[PDB]
């Protein structure tokens, strides 16, 4: 007749030996059909062995049908451990504070575990509401491999797609805390992101390391702001100042309701679930608690309890859970790190809606912004490196400085002049240096090289030079419109398949080109035999390639058409000429690198054809490009 349930609760920590014992359990709402029988126990510091042993120890013959866990601790792991016991016991367990409340991996469906922390999804939603309130539209996410990732990434994705506003997700980063780094690989990635508002997700401990690294990277300062979920803030009682100030995060409030009130909520949930299950089946929930032996019979029947227990209401307050076992909408507080060590509340948020206190301003050219460093390479006539007069100590006239890591070299020429006019017209200032690895971009296996590398590494915004254009580079980086008519061409003294095979002609024929060129790559793409044959005839440099043509020992030379035409015009004797009318296949022009779809872009293009639009290019052609040869015309 008299249906008295058996229940147990534990408190860890509390900052006391002689932690407040049995403060609650005092009869409230006695009307509920089952009366609670309570055994309370406390343990000082958490362990997998201590907790497992003790909970099983309380199980004994005692046959408890429910458990509530609470802690003073900041520890993430604890919840999972107790959850594991639940999986084993099929005995309901929940927790009201700290780590148990802290999020955990998706719970096994058969398993029964509940947390009074907010849902990961819910928290992400609140983070979004916070950003929307300050109208911070553009943001990135830094995450770690800890559980809930991708439930979080997905939740953000869902929450973000629906909204009208043109917010930007910039980057998402996944880094394993395991395989801990000598590389500061986290530093190497984190350094990349330029976004103002950062969401971070990780274990309490991990946040410290990521933050020290961010402090090295310079990410904590000046205009960037960070926003955090429940886990990092945890208890909020202890705060390593490794965390930057102005750090924004959500957590459950201690002030609103004290821990014993929360425990009362837990007990109420267990006994209400017992009362409802009773009302449905008139059946005692009580079951044998002992873990060591096989789970008691008819405990397998317990599943319905979970089904009943998911939503529970008492005191005009809803405890309703979500399939994961987090409560559907516990009250939540927006918190910030006040200057010094303070965690001081900023916002309140509940159910559907959020409310925040501070009004404004929480916690250089008008037309345009930033700076652009540029990389180039030396080629005649277009980009010429000269050694500056040592007595002068600095560059003279048209020459503009360019540095090469190995010393200041002085660059002047076609690219320098075109660049100079462009800079004058669009009105921006720029830094010029020389490339080291691979000159014009070169592909070995999987990876790019050259100026293109510095364009990809963002060590260069725009790359300038005699660089030719091709589909691959146009794919990776936006190119400027061609300023000059050029391409592949031939230069010799004086489609036929004579090129296709040397062997068809009994004497050996000879032709070669400079390796790592757009020409050589194009050749390998379209014509294999020519490449495989010409590798022997490849030459070190254009002056040396010229040495192979000029002194004999080579018949024909193949290279860029502009260079071959200028060289046609300029020769110590008119011993060299172009092929046919010099009408080139693979008709192309010299372009200029940019990053991607985001760039000054079109503004550049306009500037370029304005240059021809005023007829300057013809003059510059006569001065720089025009050779003396081709004199008999």
């Amino acid at each position: 007749k008299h249906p008295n349930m058996d229940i147990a609760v534990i408190l860890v920590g509390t900052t006391e030996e002689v932690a407040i014992k049995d403060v609650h359990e005092k009869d409230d709402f006695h009307h509920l059909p089952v009366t609670p029988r309570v055994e309370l126990v406390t343990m000082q510091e958490s362990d997998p062995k201590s907790i497992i042993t003790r909970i099983c120890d309380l199980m004994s013959d005692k046959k408890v049908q429910g458990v509530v866990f609470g802690d003073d601790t900041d520890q993430e792991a604890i919840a999972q451990i107790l959850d594991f016991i639940s999986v084993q016991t099929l005995t309901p367990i929940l927790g009201i504070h700290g780590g148990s409340s802290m999020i955990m991996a998706d719970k096994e469906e058969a398993s029964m575990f509940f947390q009074f922390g907010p849902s990961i999804e819910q928290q992400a939603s609140v983070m979004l509401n916070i950003m929307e309130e300050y109208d911070w539209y553009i943001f990135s996410i830094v995450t770690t491999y800890f559980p809930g990732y991708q439930d979080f990434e997905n939740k953000v994705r869902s929450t973000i797609e629906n909204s009208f506003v043109g917010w930007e997700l910039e980057e998402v980063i996944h880094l394993d805390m395991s395989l801990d780094d000598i590389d500061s690989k986290i530093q190497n990635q984190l350094k990349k992101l330029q976004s103002p508002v950062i969401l971070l997700y990780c274990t309490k401990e991990e946040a410290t390391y990521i933050f020290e690294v961010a402090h090295s990277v310079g990410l904590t300062g000046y205009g960037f702001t960070w926003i955090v979920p429940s886990l990092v803030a945890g208890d909020t009682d202890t705060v390593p100042d490794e965390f930057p100030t102005g750090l924004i995060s959500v957590s459950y409030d201690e002030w609103d309701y004290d821990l014993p009130a929360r425990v009362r909520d837990g007990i109420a949930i267990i006994t209400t679930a017992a009362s409802t299950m009773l009302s449905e089946h008139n059946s005692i929930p009580q079951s044998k608690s002992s873990c060591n032996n096989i789970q008691e019979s008819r405990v397998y029947e317990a599943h319905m309890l979970k089904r009943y227990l998911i939503n529970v209401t008492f005191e005009g307050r809803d405890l309703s859970f979500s399939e994961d076992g987090y409560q559907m909408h516990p009250k939540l507080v927006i918190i910030l790190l006040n200057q010094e060590r303070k965690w001081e509340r900023v916002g309140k948020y509940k159910d559907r809606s959020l409310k925040m206190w501070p009004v404004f301003d929480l916690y250089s050219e008008e037309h345009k912004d930033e700076h652009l460093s540029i990389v180039t390479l030396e080629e005649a006539p277009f980009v010429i490196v000269e050694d500056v007069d040592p007595l002068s100590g600095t560059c003279m006239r048209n020459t503009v400085p360019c540095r090469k890591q190995i010393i200041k070299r002085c660059c002047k020429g076609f690219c320098i002049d075109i660049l100079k006019k462009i800079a004058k017209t669009v009105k921006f200032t720029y830094d010029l240096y020389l490339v080291t690895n691979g000159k014009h971009g070169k592909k070995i296996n999987g990876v790019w090289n050259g100026m293109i590398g510095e364009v990809v590494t963002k060590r260069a915004y725009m790359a300038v030079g005699s660089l030719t254009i091709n589909e691959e580079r146009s794919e990776v980086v936006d190119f400027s419109v061609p300023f000059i008519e050029t391409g592949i061409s031939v230069m010799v003294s004086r489609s036929d398949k004579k090129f296709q095979r040397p062997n068809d002609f009994s004497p050996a024929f000879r032709f070669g080109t400079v390796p790592n060129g757009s020409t050589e790559r194009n050749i390998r793409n379209n014509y294999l035999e020519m490449h495989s044959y010409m590798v022997k005839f490849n030459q070190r440099s254009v002056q040396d390639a010229l040495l192979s043509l000029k002194s004999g020992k080579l018949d024909a030379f193949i290279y860029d058409a502009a260079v071959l035409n200028y060289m046609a015009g300029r020769d110590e004797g008119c011993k060299l000429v172009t092929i046919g009318s010099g009408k080139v296949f693979a008709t192309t022009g010299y372009g200029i690198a940019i990053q991607k779809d985001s760039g000054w872009k079109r503004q550049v293009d306009l500037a370029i054809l304005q240059l021809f639009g005023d007829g300057e290019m013809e003059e510059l052609e006569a001065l720089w490009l025009t050779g003396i040869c081709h004199n008999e015309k």
Binding site: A105, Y145, D176
Partner: protein, 658 residues
């Protein structure tokens, strides 16, 4: 001084514990004992998870283990019975190495972050299947998975393998475990064209799978089965279909080989580890330590990178998830309802054993895999010919110059012979037809061809509002679906290209000009540049050349002169030059050169410009084109095209006249 560095393990039996200790001692003897020594601790599997976890915290961790080894118990209870240890060690980040757990759920670093294994998971078996799929050239398959972390992981892995290629989800089929009847889902499977199947499930589930599959006779020939180690084993073996292809991991059953090797690796890892400084011993005992062990992740990092390629088990290297790499499996066949090794797989490359291949049902060798195509064409003389079928009788036995009978097929197309224009049944034979049937023998498809009503291939046209109507001609039929695939001599261009997928070019040709020889400098001819009412240059309006003229800005001026005095069709255009009505004719070479051979009264001149290729049109959405190009290339390499052009380009009488 020596320092005793403990190791710990959970193993099936005391004999295996002795094996463990022996291997450890071998590690001690063979590496410096002056600097460091290794000590071994181990325990038998316990009946529940809890006794064992308690054992780890009490019996093992009290010994300060630097790592733990684990093996599947003698009688498997549920699955992933080495679940607890990965969690328990994981709290302190103590590295765990499983010997016998091929289970996939441990691959996610997130949930088990300390977990490494000397065996690859069941998911990694897909590496074989892709290689298998690679060899046999079946791009089209079906995947049947149970619904759980295991099956879904397998799907993710295989799909990821496919992602490097054009992503191939030919079909995917998910069923939920413990379900005795699967019939409906397979009924859905048959409808899918691809005839090759691969499945992953548990033994009990696999019984139901084969049981249901046999009912619908999917075990028959023309169908292929690829499977996991678990599927061939157990009760599933009993109900298994004949000719199935199957996998078995090497030394999967043995803990001991893996013991000797794992401990060897651990030793190498430790000796490599102590080369580093700022090391800390693992926590002494579970009791009193709430903190992780800072070294543990580092120990994991070296241990994952720990090489030592020579081992009792085979090559050893570890993937990102801590799962093993370059493991070896032995392929198995069901011949005469018994398991046989058809081949063995080691490293990234399969190896073929001398045994004969078996496929399901009777095959000496039968690699078979993967319902109508409406084809459209245009009347173009070199690649297509049109004659009506004589009365009811079909096609002439007419023979090629090389002695072969000419092949032919029926085509419904526009007839101008009647005053009204009926879509008329006709006989058409061509290079493109021979190619099409070549494909048809190569490809699972069957073909029915009708010529497009409009003589034009296609061009964008008609009404102004929004974008209205669609390009007139066979292309328009392709988008409309009147014909699902287009076989004709079609030049390939970007303006068209966005709308539809294009097959790799069977032919490479460029535009050129025909003028009579008997008494045009370039693509750019001053004579063109110096047009004359007196000297005509003729083309077809709505011919793609016209699209070149309209789309291109640079020559946009030159277009208009060509626009004047345009001809409707190819025959009339050649005739004008032949009739001498028009001094010059401009068209792509592939159609023109054959004619140049045909008369020799007329000649082609200059260099092919607008260099392009001819290809078979398909919608981007249709995957058959993926095979088509794949087939086209295969036809190029053998010189099939060269011989076909050699047949259909006569070359008999003509020369350079001058």
């Amino acid at each position: 001084d020596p320092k005793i560095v403990n190791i710990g393990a959970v193993l099936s039996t005391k004999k295996h514990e002795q094996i463990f200790r022996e291997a450890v001692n071998q590690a001690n003897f063979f590496h410096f004992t002056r600097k460091i020594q290794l000590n071994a601790t181990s325990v038998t599997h316990r009946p529940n998870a809890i006794q064992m976890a308690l054992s780890v915290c009490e019996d093992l961790i009290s010994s300060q283990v630097y790592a733990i080894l684990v093996s599947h118990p003698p009688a498997p209870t549920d699955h992933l019975t080495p679940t607890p240890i990965s969690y328990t060690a994981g709290f302190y980040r103590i590295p765990v190495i499983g010997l016998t757990t091929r289970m996939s759920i441990y691959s996610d670093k997130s949930i088990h972050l300390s977990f490494l294994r000397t065996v690859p998971p069941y998911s990694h078996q897909a590496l074989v299947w892709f290689e298998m799929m690679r060899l046999f050239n079946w791009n089209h398959v079906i995947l049947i998975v149970s619904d759980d972390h295991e099956g879904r992981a397998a799907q993710k892995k295989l799909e990821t393998l496919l992602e490097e290629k054009e992503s191939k989800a030919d079909k995917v089929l998910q069923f939920e475990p413990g379900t005795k009847n699967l019939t409906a889902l397979l009924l859905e499977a048959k409808e899918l064209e691809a005839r090759v199947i691969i499945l992953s499930a548990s033994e009990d589930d696999a019984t139901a799978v084969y049981k249901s599959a046999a009912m619908l006779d999917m075990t028959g020939a023309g169908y292929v089965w690829l499977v996991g180690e678990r599927e061939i084993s157990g009760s599933a073996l009993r109900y298994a279909p004949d000719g199935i292809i199957g996998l078995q991991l090497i030394n999967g059953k043995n803990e001991s080989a893996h013991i000797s090797d794992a401990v060897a690796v651990v030793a190498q890892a430790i000796h490599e580890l102590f080369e580093m400084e700022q090391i800390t011993d693992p926590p002494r005992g579970c009791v009193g330590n709430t903190n992780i062990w800072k070294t543990g992740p580092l120990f994991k990092r070296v241990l994952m990178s720990s090489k030592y390629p020579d081992g009792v088990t085979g090559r050893i290297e570890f993937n990102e998830d801590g799962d093993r790499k370059f493991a070896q499996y032995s392929i198995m066949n069901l011949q005469n309802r018994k398991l046989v090794q058809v081949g063995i797989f080691d490293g990234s490359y399969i190896i073929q054993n001398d045994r004969k291949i078996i496929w399901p049902g009777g095959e000496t060798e039968r690699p078979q895999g993967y319902t109508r195509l409406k084809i459209v064409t245009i009347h173009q003389e070199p690649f297509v010919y049109v004659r009506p079928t004589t009365s009811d009788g079909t096609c002439r036995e007419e023979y090629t110059i090389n002695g072969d009978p000419i092949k032919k097929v029926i085509c419904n197309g526009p007839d101008e012979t009647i005053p009204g224009r009926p879509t008329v049944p006709q006989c058409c034979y061509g290079f493109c037809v021979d190619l099409l049937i070549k494909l048809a023998r190569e490809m699972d498809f069957t073909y029915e061809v009708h010529l497009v009503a409009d003589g034009k291939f296609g061009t964008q046209e008609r009404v102004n509002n929004s974008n209205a109507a669609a390009w007139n001609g066979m292309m328009g039929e392709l988008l409309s679906g009147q014909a699902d695939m287009i076989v004709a001599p079609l030049t390939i261009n970007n303006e068209r290209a966005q709308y539809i997928e294009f097959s790799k070019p069977f032919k490479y040709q460029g535009l050129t000009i025909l003028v009579k020889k008997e008494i045009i400098t370039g693509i750019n001819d001053p004579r063109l540049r110096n047009p004359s009412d007196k000297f005509i240059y003729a083309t077809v309006k709505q011919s793609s050349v016209d699209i070149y003229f309209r789309r291109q800005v640079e020559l946009s001026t030159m277009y208009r002169h060509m626009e004047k005095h345009n001809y409707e069709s190819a025959a009339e255009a050649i005739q004008a030059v032949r009739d001498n009505k028009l001094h010059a004719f401009i068209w792509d070479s592939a159609v023109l050169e054959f004619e140049a051979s045909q008369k020799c009264d007329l000649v082609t001149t200059g260099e092919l410009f607008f260099r392009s290729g001819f290809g078979i049109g398909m919608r981007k959405d249709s995957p058959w084109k993926q095979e088509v190009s794949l087939n086209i290339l295969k036809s190029h390499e053998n010189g099939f095209m060269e011989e076909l052009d050699k047949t259909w380009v006569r070359y008999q009488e003509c020369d350079s006249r001058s």
